[PDB]
Write a structure and sequence with these properties.
Keywords: Signal. The relative contact order is 0.19. The protein has 159 residues and is mostly helical. The strands form 2 sheets. Strands 1-4 form a two-stranded antiparallel sheet. Strands 2-3 form a two-stranded antiparallel sheet. Helix 4 crosses helix 5.
């Protein structure tokens, strides 16, 4: 198969932190696919620079953060290192992402999250649609039983 489960020790305490710091099950599912341990200790920017750089547990790219969040509204591609603050502020991480989705709408947020500025022109490419449904599958799992909100079960889908 191309999706399943895996045990990650401590994951349950990270899930509760996200749900107690302004997150909902929807944010948990997005963050669950981005990283294995719901954290921010991947390589800085996820290896990318300028508008492509990724920050926070959801790996929001800088283009999205500076066009659609109040924390970064109006900043330029050159200030892209400023997004790094989300790596250590979970509440702002979660809040930036919720604000971003509500500025663009769920489907264009998806397109922007996955492809950056160039996705905004067609939110329904197969690539972006494969991101949506994966996240939607994971949400269904976490919402099928509340034990999954505090155990170490990671529901994963292959990209
Ligand atoms: O240039 C376009 C546009 O890209 C934007 O970027 C991204 C970024 O590139 C990524 O797409 C990111 O999303 C991915 C994460 O980085 C990470 O790769 C993640 O990997 C998961 C994986 O999908 C899978 O679930 C995996 O599970 C296992 C399991 O752990 C176990 O090993 C088992 O045996 O095997 C399975 C299968 O592998 O676990 C991984 C986590 O460890 O997948 C994510 C989704 O693809 O999102 C960013 C933003 O959306 C920006 O850079 C933008 O600027 C740019 O324009």
């Amino acid at each position: 198969a191309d999706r399943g489960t895996e045990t990650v020790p401590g994951l349950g305490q990270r899930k509760q932190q996200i749900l107690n710091s302004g997150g909902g099950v929807w944010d948990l599912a997005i963050a669950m696919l981005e990283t294995k341990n719901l954290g921010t200790d991947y390589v800085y920017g996820d290896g990318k620079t300028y508008d492509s750089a990724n920050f926070g547990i959801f790996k929001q790219n800088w283009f999205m953060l500076r066009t659609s969040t109040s924390q970064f509204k109006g900043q330029t591609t050159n200030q892209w290192n400023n997004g790094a603050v989300l790596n250590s502020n979970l509440q702002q991480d979660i809040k930036a992402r919720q604000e971003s989705q509500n500025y663009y709408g769920p489907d264009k947020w998806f397109a922007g999250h996955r492809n950056g500025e160039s996705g905004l022109s067609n939110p329904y490419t197969q690539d972006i649609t494969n991101y949506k449904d994966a996240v939607n599958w994971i949400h269904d799992q976490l919402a099928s039983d509340p034990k999954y909100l505090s155990d170490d079960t990671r529901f994963w889908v292959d990209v």
